[PDB]
């Protein structure tokens, strides 16, 4: 005669140590503006 709940711990703390996903997310942005500038030059 007993019941219990449970609480999760989210972990995935390798990502969580940083903001969350910055491996191919923030770097992609970094190099994608570079693509934009080079294409601007190519079209110019």
């Amino acid at each position: 005669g007993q019941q219990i709940f449970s609480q999760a711990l989210l972990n995935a703390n390798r990502r969580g140590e940083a903001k969350t996903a910055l491996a191919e997310v923030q770097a992609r942005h970094q190099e994608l503006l570079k693509l934009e500038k080079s294409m601007a030059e190519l079209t110019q």
């Binding site: 992609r28 190099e31 994608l32 570079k34 693509l35 080079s38 030059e41 190519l42």
Partner: peptide, 19 residues
Amino acid sequence: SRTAELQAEIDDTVGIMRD
């Protein structure tokens, strides 16, 4: 590695076409 290759290809087309 795809994005770097695309950047390189764009740079090369830029070079050809500056010429």
